[PDB]
Amino acid sequence: PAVGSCVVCHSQTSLRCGTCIRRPFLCCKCCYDHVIATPHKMVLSVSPYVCNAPGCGVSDVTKLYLGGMSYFCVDHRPVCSFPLCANGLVFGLYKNMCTGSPSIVEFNRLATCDWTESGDYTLANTTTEPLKLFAAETLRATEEASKQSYAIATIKEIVGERQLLLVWEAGKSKPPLNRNYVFTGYKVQLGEYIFERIDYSDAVSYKSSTTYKLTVGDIFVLTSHSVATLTAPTIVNQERYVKITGLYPTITVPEEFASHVANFQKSGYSKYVTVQGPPGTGKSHFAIGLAIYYPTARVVYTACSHAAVDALCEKAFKYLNIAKCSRIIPAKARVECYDRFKVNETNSQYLFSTINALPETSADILVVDEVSMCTNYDLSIINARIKAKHIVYVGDPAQLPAPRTLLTRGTLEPENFNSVTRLMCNLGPDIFLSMCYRCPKEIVSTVSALVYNNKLLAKKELSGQCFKILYKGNVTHDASSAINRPQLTFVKNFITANPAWSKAVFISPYNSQNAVSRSMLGLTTQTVDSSQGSEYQYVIFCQTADTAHANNINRFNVAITRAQKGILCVMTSQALFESLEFTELSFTNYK
Ligand SMILES: [Zn+2]
Ligand SMILES: [Zn+2]
Ligand SMILES: [Zn+2]
Numbered sequence: 001p002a003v004g005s006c007v008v009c010h011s012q013t014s015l016r017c018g019t020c021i022r023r024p025f026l027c028c029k030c031c032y033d034h035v036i037a038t039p040h041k042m043v044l045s046v047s048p049y050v051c052n053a054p055g056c057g058v059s060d061v062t063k064l065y066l067g068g069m070s071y072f073c074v075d076h077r078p079v080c081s082f083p084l085c086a087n088g089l090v091f092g093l094y095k096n097m098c099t100g101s102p103s104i105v106e107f108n109r110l111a112t113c114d115w116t117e118s119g120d121y122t123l124a125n126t127t128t129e130p131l132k133l134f135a136a137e138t139l140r141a142t143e144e145a146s147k148q149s150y151a152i153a154t155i156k157e158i159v160g161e162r163q164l165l166l167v168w169e170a171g172k173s174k175p176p177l178n179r180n181y182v183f184t185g186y187k188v189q190l191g192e193y194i195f196e197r198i199d200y201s202d203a204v205s206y207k208s209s210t211t212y213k214l215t216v217g218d219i220f221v222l223t224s225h226s227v228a229t230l231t232a233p234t235i236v237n238q239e240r241y242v243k244i245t246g247l248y249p250t251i252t253v254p255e256e257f258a259s260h261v262a263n264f265q266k267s268g269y270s271k272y273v274t275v276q277g278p279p280g281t282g283k284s285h286f287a288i289g290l291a292i293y294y295p296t297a298r299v300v301y302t303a304c305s306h307a308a309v310d311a312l313c314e315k316a317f318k319y320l321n322i323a324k325c326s327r328i329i330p331a332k333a334r335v336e337c338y339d340r341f342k343v344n345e346t347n348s349q350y351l352f353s354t355i356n357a358l359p360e361t362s363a364d365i366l367v368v369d370e371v372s373m374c375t376n377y378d379l380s381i382i383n384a385r386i387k388a389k390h391i392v393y394v395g396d397p398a399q400l401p402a403p404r405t406l407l408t409r410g411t412l413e414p415e416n417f418n419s420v421t422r423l424m425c426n427l428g429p430d431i432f433l434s435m436c437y438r439c440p441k442e443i444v445s446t447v448s449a450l451v452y453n454n455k456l457l458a459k460k461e462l463s464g465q466c467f468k469i470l471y472k473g474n475v476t477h478d479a480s481s482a483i484n485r486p487q488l489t490f491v492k493n494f495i496t497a498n499p500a501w502s503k504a505v506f507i508s509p510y511n512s513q514n515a516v517s518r519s520m521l522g523l524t525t526q527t528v529d530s531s532q533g534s535e536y537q538y539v540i541f542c543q544t545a546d547t548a549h550a551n552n553i554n555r556f557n558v559a560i561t562r563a564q565k566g567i568l569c570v571m572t573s574q575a576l577f578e579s580l581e582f583t584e585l586s587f588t589n590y591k
Helices: 028-034 104-112 118-126 130-149 259-267 282-294 308-319 376-385 421-425 442-449 485-496 512-522 552-562
Strands: 016-018 065-069 071-072 151-158 163-168 183-185 192-197 203-209 221-222 272-276 300-301 323-329 350-354 363-368 386-395 466-469 505-509 536-542 563-570
Touching: 016 028, 016 259, 028 104, 028 505, 071 485, 104 118, 104 386, 118 421, 130 221, 130 376, 151 442, 259 282, 259 512, 272 421, 282 300, 282 308, 300 308, 300 386, 308 350, 308 421, 363 376, 376 386, 376 421, 376 512, 386 421, 442 552, 442 563, 485 512, 485 536, 536 552, 552 563
Parallel strands: 272 386, 300 350, 300 363, 323 350, 363 386, 466 563, 505 536, 536 563
Antiparallel strands: 065 071, 151 163, 151 221, 163 203, 183 221, 192 203
């Protein structure tokens, strides 16, 4: 409308800040505290607060006065007139009963910060529930406004169908050819486009909202997008029940899911349940396990990556009656997703969808997978689209968070990823998946005591092929992300003096160190990010340079736990080293 409730207190108001990126309602007290304490001096009501005299055009509430019934410049004001902005209040409708809040100072920060220091993202998650939304809107609003800052790309030459030659206009910084970046082609809108560099090279791979055939000399612009208005909270209000509501158990489970009826039932005695699942503990199993235990129920599976949502579709394909399954692909289809399920049949008993592609519907169970990789925006969008009797958050605050491409200075603790990991970390999880089915007992006991407080167990026994060395080596920055050849050279001698390890997989905290490892040892390489989901049978973690990013325990965990039988780790930090229950080697004895 244009009369609403203060986004800080709940008071009624007709005023909103006209230079904050999202124009939020502010009451007469909070608007005062906002404008005196911040560069924001433009106040909007039904009519903007500007000077009425012709051609004046000053819009600084600290300079506008009320004369008669029109607003006035200091130079233009009539004889008697009072300021719009004095006494601690801004001139609005409900001037009597605007209470205000001490939390106005948290607003002023959220409304003014550039989203670069990690201190701001922690506030965005510890604040009041209404400000949790404002932070989330403005965060996504500035992120889409930064798109127009990155440079544009022209097509120099076509190296093949379908691979291209990036050419990036200098004079403005150049965005990463990444999934987090969606370009549109061109004076005709050719479609949506996503990019990926082919084997660490100067050319780029290519998937799109197909199928236009590109002409050399085209353009790719990171198009800024529109940002929703958040109304549903990040987490719906919690309800405890005396009996399984809305859902109807079955008798009985097949032999496979019997171990999870205990937990499947819990998911029915509360409005929302939170499930932690370290790698290999089979969370996709648990998630489809619900729809088997409550076969009458409509369940909607959702997550962030099309990869995660496809991971659920697959586990569902072999356990569920594909007749009433549907994959919800948006109108703009850029990634090739699942194919065996029907498409866009918004009525089927089983729905699979990206959060962004969620349709407005309802469910008896809503399953949100990879919850750590969410943003509080993502949550509020889930609760707005899906009215649901139950919600089962499934994720792991020890694995990866969502990439926050604006954050440069700072470290975000896992307790402040979502409103949901904040719960999992302080209160603990409701369900915990404690049996690891993927890893040798050596590496699971190291994580189980590093990040899981020894709640995590092992099924595989020890493997022996778990090794450990404190080789510092020197680091060199040809590329900004670091490089350390002196310890890769150790790997070469290791692998050359070793047998099956040739089929190992290289995992380093740094995007460059992998690339050179492609030169010096030519193994299959995967970033710790590009390894969640996949599991490998021999891995080598070559950390580097003692940066924070390198000592990041969470990312450490996802890398290590890719292993099925064997692992070694050349370590650049003496402290983390002795936490690995792996057999140590030395430079003089790496036999
Ligand atoms: Zn403002
Ligand atoms: Zn207020
Ligand atoms: Zn004026």
